[PDB]
Amino acid sequence: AMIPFLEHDDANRALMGANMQRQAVPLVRSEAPLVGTGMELRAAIDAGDVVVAEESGVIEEVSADYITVMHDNGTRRTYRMRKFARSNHGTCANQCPIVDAGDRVEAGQVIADGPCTDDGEMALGKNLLVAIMPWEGHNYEDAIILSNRLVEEDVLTSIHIEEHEIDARDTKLGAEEITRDIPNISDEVLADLDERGIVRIGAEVRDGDILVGKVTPKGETELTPEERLLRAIFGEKAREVRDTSLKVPHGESGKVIGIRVFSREDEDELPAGVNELVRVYVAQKRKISDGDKLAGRHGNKGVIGKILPVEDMPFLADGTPVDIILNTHGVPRRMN
Amino acid sequence: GGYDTPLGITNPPIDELLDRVSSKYALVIYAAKRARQINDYYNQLYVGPLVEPGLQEKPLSIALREIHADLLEHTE
Amino acid sequence: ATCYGRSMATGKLVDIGEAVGIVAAQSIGEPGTQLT
Amino acid sequence: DGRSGEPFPYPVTVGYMYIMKLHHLVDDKIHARSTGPYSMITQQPLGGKAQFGGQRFGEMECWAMQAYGAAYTLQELLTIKSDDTVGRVKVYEAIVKGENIPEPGIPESFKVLLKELQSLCLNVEVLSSDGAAIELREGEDEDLERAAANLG
Amino acid sequence: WLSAASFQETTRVLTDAAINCRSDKLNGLKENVIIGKLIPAGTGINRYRNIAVQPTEEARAA
Amino acid sequence: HQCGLPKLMALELFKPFVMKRLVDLNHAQNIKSAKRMVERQRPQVWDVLEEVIAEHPVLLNRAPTLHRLGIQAFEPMLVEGKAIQLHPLVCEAFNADFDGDQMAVHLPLSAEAQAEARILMLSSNNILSPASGRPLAMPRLDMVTGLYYLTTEVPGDTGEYQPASGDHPETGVYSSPAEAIMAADRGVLSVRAKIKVRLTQLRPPVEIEAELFGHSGWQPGDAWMAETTLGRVMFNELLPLGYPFVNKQMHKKVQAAIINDLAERYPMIVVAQTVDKLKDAGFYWATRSGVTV
Amino acid sequence: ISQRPTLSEDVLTDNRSQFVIEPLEPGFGYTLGNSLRRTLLSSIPGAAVTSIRIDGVLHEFTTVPGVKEDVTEIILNLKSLVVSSEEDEPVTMYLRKQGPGEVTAGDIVPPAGVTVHNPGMHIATLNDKGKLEVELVVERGRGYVPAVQNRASGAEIGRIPVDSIYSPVLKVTYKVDATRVEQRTDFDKLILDVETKNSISPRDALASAGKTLVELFGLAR
Amino acid sequence: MLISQRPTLSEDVLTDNRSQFVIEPLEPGFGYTLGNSLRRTLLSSIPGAAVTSIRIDGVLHEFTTVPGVKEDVTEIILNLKSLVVSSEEDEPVTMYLRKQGPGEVTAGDIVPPAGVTVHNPGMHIATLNDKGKLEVELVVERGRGYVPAVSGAEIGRIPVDSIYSPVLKVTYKVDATRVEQRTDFDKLILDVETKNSISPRDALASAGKTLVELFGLARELNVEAEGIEIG
């Protein structure tokens, strides 16, 4: 019911559109569509991820953290905002208040926008200036051409939060340790770790960086002959360890937005053998890129094959560059 | 001789390379074994390249050029 | 090679080493998704 | 036209369309591996990007390789690039030293097949040309000879 | 029997092959793939596989 | 014969080669430090990477593999972004639509594997369907449209040839196709208008060649008067030099007949360059064809 | 046939002007206006914010007490800053606001040589509990440079890099009058329409584009 | 404002009148900045001389066939448009072509007045049969680009399409080139074919001077920092 001009689209393409709306990712800023069907508001409200006022009243205080509304009864109700929360699929659930201090609100009114909401309506995308035409083979075969403005002004940008988890447990050779002291590792690459060996809130982590330092007991038969030569020459420590530290996977970048740590030394319930459990949350700002998949509500979809400089785009007589170029050949045969 | 100056992997025309050899597979084995010889020549310094090599040129390209120039005899 | 005749890809007479049974199976099965 | 500057000769449909960013994103899809972890069971590369895994070369891709008649590509993919345990390390040595890629060995998958057949009470022997049964193992002294000669 | 076992009815093929004490000649491109041997087709046949390649005297002179 | 390879992808795929060539030069002290530099993406690796990439083919595959053309060999070139760039002419072979389709890359290592990639599996070495023999790497979609727009004849179009009735001679004649291009730069001549051009560098059709040049075949430099549109001249210039002039509106069937004929009578490399020329022209003129909804 | 092109400016607003080059070869107006447009969009130098520091926040995804907008929305609001700098070196601006009120761009105190051209531009809203203290590093450059990571610099964790858009130009277009007469003399009049962000005048932007294009077209000689 | 790595201009000579120039590396997008303006400048901005009109003796009202010559009227117009000529002062300058004896006529048989030059004297014009007489007047002026035929007035004089430009054909392409981790840099390729009047080199140089003068008009509005590539 959210597909405009649904009656003008064939059933297969409309099926694809309905399915892809459920695949839209929340953008850092939501923008309601100029052309809706009217289902957007009740969809967002009943979905629940928007914050709704349960009772009428006046906003007593408003912050990014919470809204509190003073009811006519003299009673108070305060709504706490979910801020940069990681969803099951890694998209960013971020609520923001749409009300101001002196505002009067009613029961049922939307106090705060959630993910993919603009002033209470489901907003799954952006209104883009489109031009239907072939352009230099770059939109060939469902490929889509975008203006670099969409990258520079962050209109298709989204936040994706990844949960990295590592634990220290008992092994054959004894307990693992989460520590800042990692053999054969420079002080330069340990800089962003705290005294426990855990990365620090706000650190920028890249491919291969250390998140949580960890060492695992090693056997003396696993030393290289040279390592055993050093150990026997200098009479080194009897404890031999391997570097099992949690590292950022390949192709991942971001900032650390959160750290949660659980230990046996406290009352924290942990599975048998597991001494310490630490979780690191990394948030990535993803600008639209070649290879990302875009779609309209009618089942028309493709990957970005080229992102052109703003000056390369076709522009209207007044100098306005188009945002997106969709290939003409795609439209008529899909029957949308 | 009706083609523009070739680019990259097409440097010897595939048709002209197919004149020196009966089939594509035999050309594959010729170029492969000759390439192995050329790479063995550079490890000890064996037969050196019979064509002036490019700055950095893969021994398989040198081998294909040598086959193009009829500088190698091949026995099936 | 002479009974099989021309290789469709090369346009020349089929080479000796060519495995024409797999080319035949793929040639018959590739369009098979169009059969109703 | 923003490039030449000429006007496009015919009026083009323009307007505003609502476009969504789908959750298929190239940042998640791009993956590449030269060499990485292998399974302790099948001794093939692990699968999946999170595991830094290798690509699946399947039955139909082997059909494609055979229809091309490429024997060494097919053998290389299924031996020194997958479950050949000595062939893979020796291949990395050969590339790093700028030498020729060595001759492939025996896939671990065939040994596993034989072990499973034996576990089914099937007596499966690999016969040579003379009729005797070959025994499949690996010499332990080679790694010890090289490792010992390493120091001097 | 190795090729027939990898196609369909593996259990039956292996039972019959076991009772009949069959010996697979190991010549075919499915069997050679399994054991890691060059397939007997394309570049793998003996004509193309084993070949002598040496430069001519005229080319070695120049 | 080429494919775009994302830089990081190529750096990982070719990593040992980049390390070896990195130790050959003095960028890396030894091979272990070379590994440390490639893993850290130190700026020294991009020149060396571009070097080792050169003329080293890679295999591209799109599942499902229905026929052997489902795997093809290309020369990789370092490209911006994380996406693999695929040539528009091989899509038909891979059944590749860009809706989010993905493809796999494989790096041949041994000299035999590389030789098989360059020779057996190379993209430009397989133009034709292994089943029907018809051309696959043939133009389609926008390309067709562009060429179809280019070779169409529009009666009454700007600069159309005139009978020269009255007090003036023929106004639709041009000494060379270059002069016609000059006229089209101004508003005087439409690319699709019927005109008369003197052509030195293009071979006439069978009837006109036998009539005008008799027994002696046509030679480059010999001028002849052609009645066509400038667009059809620009199209025929994409065909191989010495190909008989085709004065026709180019449908898909006509392009398939021309490329079928080139496959039979011409070398494979000639066809491979011809379809690329037809590609550039077909796209360029596709954007200017005015097709819209 | 001999006459030379003349550039005459006609002002419309403070930040918008038109530029007429009357005599031109026929068909030569579009491509000239487009080279000017392209150079004006890509290459014009300007000033923009590089990074910011906010007291009490170590990264962008988080809130400040008493502030309605989170740090992501605050940075997005700072994207609307139009700023000019003569220093050609990184220079720091400061912002401090307490109590209830609206923090705007006018509340920023720039150092000498740096001007904020839209003081009314909204930044944040603060209630009785809100306090906002921000450092903003301004640099000089051209084009669009994405946020410079702390790995590529010696920046510490508290420093939040920001995407920098240096282009002072806003919307550039052109129109040509193609004069074609039955008489042999034909010419194209070029009208180049230039608008700017209030950071510089259209005249100066077209001058910069002119020097860039002269420098680059001198390569053929 | 910042400095750019200096692009270079290279020349690959194909024929004496035909050359390809390569300007690389260019910052991303600038190949299309320079490309169409350099092409249109090369074509339309270089002054040259050509035939404005001709008058053929024996035919005025007809214009179909010329008696005594194998070629028709328009076929004479075609290869007369191919005439490569240069003049000094700019005024219409009349020339005369006359031949009697059977044979073939060339551009050398035209009598140049003082101050004009025929650069292709070997160019075929017409074939004179037995007793055939050829008399034609060729007006030559200096101009730019390609001006279509401009007539009434006195009969026998036909205006013709005047190719003033010394350059015959120009086409450009922008290819990817890599500068230090960026593979998207622009590489400009110009393919230019000219009359023997001037070389493609001097044509590209004249186009450079013209465009430097043109953008100098914007350069003159102020003096402010811009991209500076020299050195």
Main-sheet strand order of chain A equals: 12-26-13-25-24
Q: Just name the CATH architecture of the largest domain in chain G.
A: Beta Complex
Please give the share of residues in helix of chain A.
10-25%
Total strands of chain G: the figure is 15
Report, as a whole number of angstroms, the end-to-end distance of chain G. Answer: 24 Å
For the largest beta-sheet of chain A, the strand count, sense and barrel status come to: 5 strands, mixed
Helix vs. strand class of chain A: mainly beta
* Main beta-sheet annotation of chain G: 5 strands, antiparallel
Share of helical residues of chain G: 10-25%
CATH homologous superfamily descriptor of the largest domain in chain G: DNA-directed RNA polymerase, insert domain
Give me the CATH fold name of the largest domain in chain G.
Answer: RNA Polymerase Alpha Subunit, Chain A, domain 2
Number of domains of chain G: 2
User: For the largest beta sheet of chain G, what order do the strands appear in spatially?
Assistant: 7-5-10-3-12
Topology order of chain G in helix (H) and strand (E) letters: EEHEHEEEEEEEEEEEEH
PDB class: transcription
Keywords: Mycobacterium tuberculosis, RNA polymerase, holoenzyme, sigH, transcription
Entry title: Mycobacterium tuberculosis RNA polymerase holoenzyme with ECF sigma factor sigma H
Chains A, D: DNA-directed RNA polymerase subunit beta
Protein architecture, described:
It is classed as transcription. The entry lists the keywords Mycobacterium tuberculosis, RNA polymerase, holoenzyme, sigH, transcription. The entry is titled "Mycobacterium tuberculosis RNA polymerase holoenzyme with ECF sigma factor sigma H". Chains A, D: DNA-directed RNA polymerase subunit beta. Organism of A, D: Mycobacterium tuberculosis H37Rv. The structure is cut from a larger assembly and holds two copies of chain A, one copy of chain B (76 residues), three copies of chain C and two copies of chain G. By secondary structure, chain A is mostly beta strands. Helix content of chain A is 11%, strand content 35%. Chain A is globular and about 80 Å long. The two termini of chain A are 16 Å apart. Chain B is mostly helical. Chain B has one domain (1-76). In chain B, 46% of the residues lie in helices and 5% in strands. In chain B, α2 (24-44) packs across α3 (59-68). Chain B is globular, with a radius of gyration of 12 Å. Chain B starts with 13 loop residues before the first helix and ends with a strand. With 36 residues, chain C is mainly alpha-helical. The longest helix of chain C is centred in the last third of the chain and has 10 residues, at 20-29. With 221 residues, chain G is of the alpha+beta class. Chain G has two domains: 1-45 and 167-221, 2-Layer Sandwich (Gyrase A, domain 2); 46-166, Beta Complex (RNA Polymerase Alpha Subunit, Chain A, domain 2). Chain G has helices spanning 29-43, 71-78, 202-217; strands at residues 7-11, 16-21, 45-54, 83-85, 91-97, 101-104, 108-109, 114-116, 122-126, 132-142, 144-145, 160-161, 164-165, 169-179, 187-196. In chain G, the strands form five sheets. In chain G, strands 7-5-10-3-12 form a five-stranded antiparallel beta sheet, with no helix packed on it. Chain G has a four-stranded antiparallel beta sheet with strand order 1-2-15-14, covered by helices on one side. A two-stranded antiparallel ribbon of chain G has the order 4-8. The two termini of chain G are 24 Å apart.
